[PDB]
Design a protein around this nucleic acid. Sequence first.
RNA 1: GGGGGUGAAACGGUCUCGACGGGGGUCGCCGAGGGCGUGGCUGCGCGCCGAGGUGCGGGUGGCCUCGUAAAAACCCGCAACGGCAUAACUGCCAACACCAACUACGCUCUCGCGGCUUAAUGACCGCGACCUCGCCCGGUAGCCCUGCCGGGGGCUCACCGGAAGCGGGGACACAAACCCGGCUAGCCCGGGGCCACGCCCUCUAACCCCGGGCGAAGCUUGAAGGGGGCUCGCUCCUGGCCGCCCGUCCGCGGGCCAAGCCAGGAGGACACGCGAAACGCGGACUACGCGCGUAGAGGCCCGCCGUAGGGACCUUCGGACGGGGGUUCGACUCCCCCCACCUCCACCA
Length: 143
Amino acid sequence: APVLENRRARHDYEILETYEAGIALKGTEVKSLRAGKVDFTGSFARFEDGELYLENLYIAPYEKGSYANVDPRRKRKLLLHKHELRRLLGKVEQKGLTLVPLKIYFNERGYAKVLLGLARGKKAYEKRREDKKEAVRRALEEL
RNA sequence: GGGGGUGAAACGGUCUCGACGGGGGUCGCCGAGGGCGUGGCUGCGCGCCGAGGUGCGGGUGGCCUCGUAAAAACCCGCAACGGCAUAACUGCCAACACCAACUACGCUCUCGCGGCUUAAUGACCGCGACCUCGCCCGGUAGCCCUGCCGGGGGCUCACCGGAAGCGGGGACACAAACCCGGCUAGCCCGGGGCCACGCCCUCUAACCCCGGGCGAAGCUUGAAGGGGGCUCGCUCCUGGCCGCCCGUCCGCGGGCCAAGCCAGGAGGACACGCGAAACGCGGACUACGCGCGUAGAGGCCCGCCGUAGGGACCUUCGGACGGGGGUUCGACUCCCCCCACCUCCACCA
């Protein structure tokens, strides 16, 4: 369906700030999300950058047999002017509240976008002893 | 085996709200103290020799060219530089140290009886020692209080000793081999007077200090002065020397002074100064030597905004429907047409 979502932050983690970005991609992914595939892969980013390069994300290839696609979890440009794209960047390197795809989707005109945020929900902070039990019961179920 | 469903949530209005990459602006980064001279000064300039570099340069012999000409080298560096990146740790496998129960501890440092400190048990303390040390009194040797008034402070186990008082043991680690407290160093022999409006003989000082004497030998008082003994002119300052010629070199000329002498005067010292004159009109600047013309890395102005060049950035404009060509804003669709993988079709050798 042309609006779906990525639940890897909605029972697992969830957001502290939300943003969205258009993502150019080579047409070979379009029918698969428009029909009904979704993703849950761990996106990351690396970002001493002018824009904000996302690392990893499946829209899925469209398929019958082999088709003409190339792996979707490659780098993609992210639409938004540099200054407020630096607002999405503003906390991305804090290693604890971290970049997540929230909802892959298309706009009304059929071009692809991703709702994005920065999130946590397992533990108050990692690498502590105390709150790891809440990261394996609770933060794989609730939020 | 081929033809075609189809790889899009819109017949076209399909301008992902917003990326990039060319613009519109910039103009700071950006081969640069935002400049450069195709130009000028001082009676027409300027020297008496000297410049240059390999890719980018530190260094280095004046290699060498060689004056109508400021024209062609090199050892070594730059080469060297050990650059990773989120949101879920609790798993695999590992460990920790002194004493008097007893042999010195209260026992220094060779012996002998009691005590009783864990039984320190004849070494401590109350005491019995040859031989040495100490207190306390006496002597050769040591005495640099060398005045009197109260007391000649007064003697050292050094060299010898327990006698007039006495004690430990092989070390009880000394103070006197020079001392306290009062009168001007008294009592008294004796040296001597200098420096600050120059000093002292006279003076604020019985003239005096006090180095010093009797158990053994020689420098001052002064805060102020008329005259004298000392090194003095009381003490200093009035005119000849000297310092200087004004863009680089000078034609034509030549006086005075900050200040000591030789030598006269003036105030109370050497506490701080009484008016004749050092430059001025010009003679050149290779146009009077070797030379020529912008000499060849002096010193300041005058004239061209030196280009906005040399660069890279924002927003903003141009966008990914499997690719690939039409094209009124895109266009597997409206149309030509390439590949996946399926769906429909005329066949045995």
